[model samples]
Structures are given as structure tokens and as C-alpha cells.
Target: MTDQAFVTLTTNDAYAKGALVLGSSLKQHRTTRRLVVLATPQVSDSMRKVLETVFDEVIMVDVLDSGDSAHLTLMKRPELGVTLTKLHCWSLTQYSKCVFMDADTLVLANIDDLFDREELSAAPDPGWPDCFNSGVFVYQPSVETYNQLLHLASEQGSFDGGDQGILNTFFSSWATTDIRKHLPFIYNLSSISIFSYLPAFKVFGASAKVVHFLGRVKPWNYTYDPKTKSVKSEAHDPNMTHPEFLILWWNIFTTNVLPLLQ
Candidate 1:
């Protein structure tokens, strides 16, 4: 088996649904490496049922409650939840290396080729194209790195109030240092960026390996219009009932993720 791998996280049912699609989409492209999920204690039995079907490993992690110090420290910084959960990826030493994908991202192609990159490799965040996006990237598990991340969090919290800000500050060096470290935008393409900068997106988006549904709207939250390629809304619409992508996600959640339970 390839030494490289991938990982994801989902503490709630909604996010769990996203995780299922991530695994199925990765499988659709026939990723050669292993797939894993960092689940939390709150995952419902039903969500757990679906997760078990797709991932090679379903790891349960300690959930950081808002009342805890990590959350308390967030009073001055609220966006740390995703960052803390994301940092948990470091605890997975089972694989030599891994690519962490947000549940909201869709893998359009086999991205295992990303394994060739070293630690802290990621595409630029749409919000701040200068900094890498946390939606997807390759990394290796290291307790040392995890501790540094935590210490950094305690000392200097994220700017945007989420994982992106924390990651930007943590991997701040990637800004102007290395070229090999940068993954093409296609690896973690954001559709919003396409809408914002069509010219640039059209040029680079054709090769997109993963798609991120960033910001307020997500694939699940929409009522997809096949003709327009737009979502109507979440309520009282037949279009929202069966989006091609959503149905694909549901199928993966129900049938495919079942196998992982073994």
C-alpha cells in the first residue's frame, strides 16, 4: 500500500454527512492510499453507522467543550474550535503522512499525488489567497507539531476566529518561502472564488482536484437547480429534495459507510 493517506473530521450528523461524501468521492476517483475520519463522542449512532461504511479508520477523539480552557481561551478568540479539531489530525500516527479534508470539500479527482509533498502543504485560502486554506492539505502526524500548535493557540489566537486564521498564523512561514510547498489551487478549489474572479478561476479551476463549499452556503444547504446550477433554498422546494450531489452523498452515507462498522 502507498505510505501516503487522507483524514477528515465530523462531530455532528450534518458534518458526518459531509464526511461520507468526502470518502465516497475519494473512492470514486480510486485513491490508492488509506482514508480515515476523526470522529467525536457526540456523533449520533446513525451518523456513526454511515461513517463506518467508508473510512479505513474511524477514530474517536476528545471533544473540546466551549466551557473548557481551550474554549474559554477563545473568549478573546472564537474561531479556535475548528483549529483544535483540525490539530487532532496530528494524533493519527497510524499513517506516515495524511491529507486533511474538511467535511465540506468534494474530491473531484485522485489527489493521492499530493502525498509527494512534505509537511504543511496546502492551497491558498479563498478569504486570504495569500494564506493556505485548511479545507485540504497534506501533513504528517507529530506530537511535537501538535504541542507547538497548541502553544501558539494559547499565545496568539486566530484572526478570522476559525481554523484558517490559526493555521495562517501557525504556518505563517509559507507566505513567501517555498514553491514546492504550494499545491495548485485546483487541489482545493473554492467555487466562491470562481464567482469572484472568473478569469483567474477559469484558467486554474479546470484542473481542480478538490472542491470546497466555503462560507454561508454548502451543497447540503441548497435546493439545486440542475438547469441553472444554483440552489433555490433549504425549505419547501422539491429541488432541494434530491440534488445529484446530495443523493450521491446520501447513498454513500447509508450503504457505503456501513462497511467500516466492521
Candidate 2:
């Protein structure tokens, strides 16, 4: 890859904080590739400045609405609309290759090698092993592919009401056609695994290279005590599997990001 980057998206200030932590974690792990954050106009100027500190570039993108009836129906739910903005990542052709990671993601290691993968390299979604999660994926930057994705979205829309459905539909052959495109779960470990199979997570949690806070409650909503340097959730989920990750997230935030903000 001549020029590659690790990219994330943030539609608002809340997710901007997540992107900050994501960037901080990437830096702490010493990733050699460029780090970019795709932000919508909704992001505040102050937030953009904060993102610029950790990200090499914070590109502003317009939100592309999927007029698919299904996607529109899902938009009725608050905050599900901006997900369509994620398609902008494909439009960034300045980089030869890019790894799109969700803002909620925390990197644990230097995953720059992901640039070596070809377009559409992603781990299977825990919800459906056949469908890859859009949270993290490797792809080549091409105007042709980007335009095609826009055409596909405009023509068919998405079934799941967001980018995941559109991506899975466009890359339909990923499930059975090519095994090489399938990345290991360690690359994009979501809460689906922890809650779905707690036993398995307990056994392999240490091996996970990325952690995704996929649910409604994000790490920022919790309180981080700097003195004790621990995470405290005001309303904890009874079924929460790995509390250690919350601690880990807070540790990274305090050690890598909080100081910068202060």
C-alpha cells in the first residue's frame, strides 16, 4: 500500500470522544499508518480541534441518506440515521488503502498489517457468522468502488437499515466465495460474543486485539476516577460479561486522552 490509513467516523460530539479514545489507543500501540477521522458537519468546532490532535486528518463528509424504505423505517429510531455517513470512508481515495474502524472501537495492538489485506477483508459479525461486521474492515480506495456503493444504496437500499446491510449485499460473495477475505474475530470483537457465549470470551478475551462497545451505553457515559484510576458505571447492566474492558477503556482514556484535554 503506497499510502494507507486507519479511519473512523463521528457524527456528533459523543462519538467524537470515542474517536479520540480510538485514536489515543492507536497511538499508544504505535501504529505506523496514518489515522483519519471522518466527521459530519454536526460535529462542533471544538470537537474537531480535539480530534485533530490525535488524528492526522479530520475530513468532513456529507451524510448520504439511504432512501430505502427499510433504512427510512429504521431511521425512526434516534441516532440510527448518521450511520449512512459511514459510506464516506470509501470516497477517501487519497489513501491507497484504508481500514475503517467504528468510533466505539479500542485498538490493543499495532494492526497496521491490515493494509496488506485486499478490499473487503472483515471479520464475521457475531450476530451472523456469514455477514461481516462493518465495525472494522479493510478496503482499497477507489472512486469506482465508492460510486458503485452509492449506486447500490440508491437502487436497492439496505435491509438492516444501515451500512452493514448494504455492504453485506454488495460484497455478497464474501461468505462462500473467498475464505481469505474472512478476518479472525480478534480483529473486531463486539459485545455479541461476550453476551452470546460468555464461556468462550472468558477463554479467549486476552487474545482480542480490538474491543467494541457496541451497545447503547458507551464508555464515556461512565465516570472515570483519576485518583483511583478506575471505571464506575452509574447503572450497570446485570448481564455485563467483562467488566475488565470498562476498566481498560477508562485506563486508556485517562492515560492517553484525558491529559491532552486537560
Candidate 3:
């Protein structure tokens, strides 16, 4: 078996559907790499079966909580605790190299080339160019790195009380390191950027390889009319949903995922 693959995590059934769509999209794009999913026990058996249909492997992993008492002080959402489970991706020693994509991410192009990137390769966050977004990245699996991450988590809790903070801190070198390790924004495009910087997005939007639904709303939260090929997004700001990307997500789901779940 190839020692490289694409990995994603799902803490529950809701995210499982997103993971399924991601796997299906990879396959649809004819990615040569294998597709793997790390899931928490909270995922339903039915959802696991649905994932099994698309993912090459559906791994069951422990839910690692950040256990940050500051969470109460920060008033962070309880769900953020489950995000620490993402650290398990580093322990997947079976794959020499892997590209990690968030469940909320939709692959718009063949990103198998990401395998060529070294561990810690990621795009800058739209909110902050210096700090890479944890939504998508290329990493090499190592038990040592995983252990160190656990130790670091225990010693210095994530600032954001989530995986992104821990990862950004652990991979501190990424901030001022080699430019090659810094992937372009196109690799992990946030939907919000389109509105935040419409001029730049208009210039570079077509080059986006991945589209991330990074805010409170997710593509799955909205309704899709397959007949009309349109979406009725429930976003508080009706314009939060990008029509082209949203349509593509639903199309991939209806074509690649909905039938299998049925």
C-alpha cells in the first residue's frame, strides 16, 4: 500500500457527512492517494458505514479534550474541546506523509500535489497571514512529534483552546521559515475572504483549490434544491453563502454522497 494518503477527522455524525463528501470529492477528482478518516466514537454506526463506503479506512480514535479551565473564562464553545482530537493525525505512523483537510473544507481541484509538501506546510490564515490555518496542511506522521504535541498540550494549553492554537505554537518556525512551506491562500480559501476582500478575491478566486466554510454556518446547515441547483442558506447575513462554491458542494453531495447515504 502507498504510504501517503489524505486524512480528515469527524467528531460526530454531522461532520461525518462532510467527511464523506470530502472523500467522494477526492475520488471524483481521481486523486491517486488513499483517503482516510479519523472519527470519534460519537459517530453513529450508520454514519461510520456511510464513511466506509467512501473512505479507504475509517479509524476510531479517542476524543482528546483540551481540558483548559480557561475555556470557562474564555466562554468558548464546548465543542472546541473535541478539536484537540485532531492531534491524532500526527500519530498515524502508517502513512509516511499525509495531507490533513478539515471536514468543512471542499476540494475544488486535484490537490494530490500537496503530498509533495513537507510536514507543517500550510497556507496563511485569512485573518492573520503570519499564522497558518489549521483547516488544511501537509504533515509527516511521527510518534515523537505526536508525543511532543501531547506534552506541549499538557504544559502550555492552546491559547484559542483549540487545535489551531496548539499547532501554530508547536510549529512556530512556520511563521518566518522558508517561503516554499507557506502555501498560497488559494490552497485554503475561506468563504469570508470573498466579501472581506472582494477585489483581491475577484482577482484570485478562480485559482482556489479548496474552499473552507470557516464561520458559524456550514454548507450542510443550509438547504439545497437539486432541481433548481440553488441553495437557500440560513446564514444570518444572506450574503455569507457564496453561490458558486455552495452549488458545487451540494452538487458533489447529491452526485457523490446523497445516493450512498440513501
Candidate 4:
């Protein structure tokens, strides 16, 4: 028998803001599962305290830097990118299973149903349409699996020099395996690059459970206008329409986080 649980793991300081919103949203959605955030040593003391208030556990994971012997062995490694960071999630053997999400994703609904998935379950990538999106996944922790991943990284460098490439290689059989293991794209819907893929978005956009701000532009950096139902890159843009998303962002950031910490 398997005990089901969930966690939020982040590798850097920049990602912690998103992690805060993720945990808060899960609580708002009435999630009964546990909340966690994996932090690196450099994450600010303030950030750690804020995360502690929301996450059940604020874990410190060591990210061996370029000077480390492990990093020396690995050639063509991308510094502080998602690839090296993702490996830290494996160290979390406390949970029977865990769900990992990128810091930029926003949870709109009760996605706790994700607990039903088995280990190594995730959605396909929006960019490639064939590979899994490394940002979000369900996995089980095992030292054996961790060792294999590190071994694989040293032997075969990642495709994009990031987690996406490493994950594809690790789950080589995902494409041909049972489709049930594959999640609907809405679970990891990337709103950032919608202009590039409009047709599919036109049909399925309304059903997205979470919106991933995948690229350089993040939703939190923008402002929304309610009357027009639009968003502006600038906080005070006249064209900006404040939609529920904007309100949700403010509610999470200001209403809960700011006041509690102060």
C-alpha cells in the first residue's frame, strides 16, 4: 500500500516567491496534503522565515557549486539552472511521493487529485509536444534512482542543458507507455507562450488548472485592469484590465504574506 502526499521544492531564492504563492493557493483550495519547500543555503533568512510560515517543512538542500568535485566531473553543466536544482528533490525521502512544480506556476483549482498519479507521472511539454515538461511532475524518492540520475548526467549531457533533457532521457519509455500516465496539458498549462500556439489555446485555454509563466515575463511583474479584463506589463498601464488572476496574485502576495510577516 502507498501513502499519498505532496510537496513544493525550489532550488533558488528567486523561485521562493512562487513557492509561497503555491503553498498559499493550495491552502485556499482546501488541500489536506502536506506542503514543503526545499531551499538552498543562499536563500535569505527573511525568505526562509516567510516560507516556514506556509510550508510544513522548510528544508535546506546543498547545491554543490562549480568548485565542488561533483560539478568538476560533470562537463557542460549549466550553472544554477533547473537541471542541477531538480536533483535535490530526490533527497526528500521523507514523503512516500511528491509533486514538484516550477516557481512560476499559479494554481487556480484543487489539483490535489494529482496525488492519484504514480511515480514519474507528468504532462507533455507545450514546446516540443513530445517530451515531458520538467516544471511539474509526480515522483517517488529513492537513493538508487538518485544515483542513476547523477550517473546518467555525467555520461550523457542534457539536451537543453537543463532538467527537460535529463528527464526525457530518464523516462525514455514515456512516449510509448500507457497514455493514462500522461496528464492533460491543462494541468501544466503554460500561458507565457500562447501567441506561438494559439489554435490549441483557443480550444483548451478555459480549462487550464494552472498557468505556467514559463518565459522571462512573469504574471506577478504585471498589473491588471478589472473593467477591461486585461493585463499590462507595467503596473499602471491604462490598457491593463484587472482580471481575477491579477486579484489572485495580489491577494496571495499582499493580503496573506505581507501582513503575516510584518
Q: Identify the candidate with maximal lDDT.
A: 3
Which sequence of candidate numbers ranks them by TM-score, best first?
3, 2, 4, 1
- C-alpha local distance difference test of each model: 0.71, 0.83, 0.84, 0.69
Ranking by lDDT: 3, 2, 1, 4
Q: Point out the worst 10-residue segment of candidate 1 by lDDT.
A: 237-246
Model 3 / residue 217 / CA error / Å: 0.7
Colliding pairs, model 4: 224-242, 225-241, 225-242, 226-242, 230-241
Which structure is stronger by lDDT: 3 or 4? 3
Q: Report the error of model 2 at residue 254, Å.
A: 2.0
Weakest 10 consecutive residues of candidate 4 by summed lDDT: 235-244
Candidate 2 residue lDDT tens string, 1-262? 3488999999898888899999999988988889999998989998899899999999999877664555546545345655878888888889998999999899988888788788899999876789998999999888898899888877877887688889999999999988888888889988642364467777887998998887567888887787986656454462245667677778888778877675
Q: Mind sharing the TM-score for model 1?
A: 0.80
Summarize candidate 4's per-residue lDDT along 1-262 as a digit string, tens digits: 1344456656656677778887887788887778878788778888899899888889887763323334323424434344456777776777778788877777888888887887688888876777888778888887888888877766775656666677788987777787876878888876443334356665766777876766555555666454554555554331123234545665676666666566
Residue 114, model 3: lDDT of 88
> Could you tell me the lDDT of residue 83 within candidate 3?
84
Q: Model 4 off-target regions past 4 Å?
A: 1-3, 64-82, 194-197, 223-247
In candidate 3, stretches whose alpha carbon ends up further than 4 angstroms from where it belongs are 69-77, 191-197, 235-241
Please write out the lDDT profile of model 1 over residues 55-146, one tens digit for every residue: 88788887642223453354344433554677788877767899899988878778878888988899887666898988887888888888
Q: What is the lDDT of residue 129 in candidate 3?
A: 74
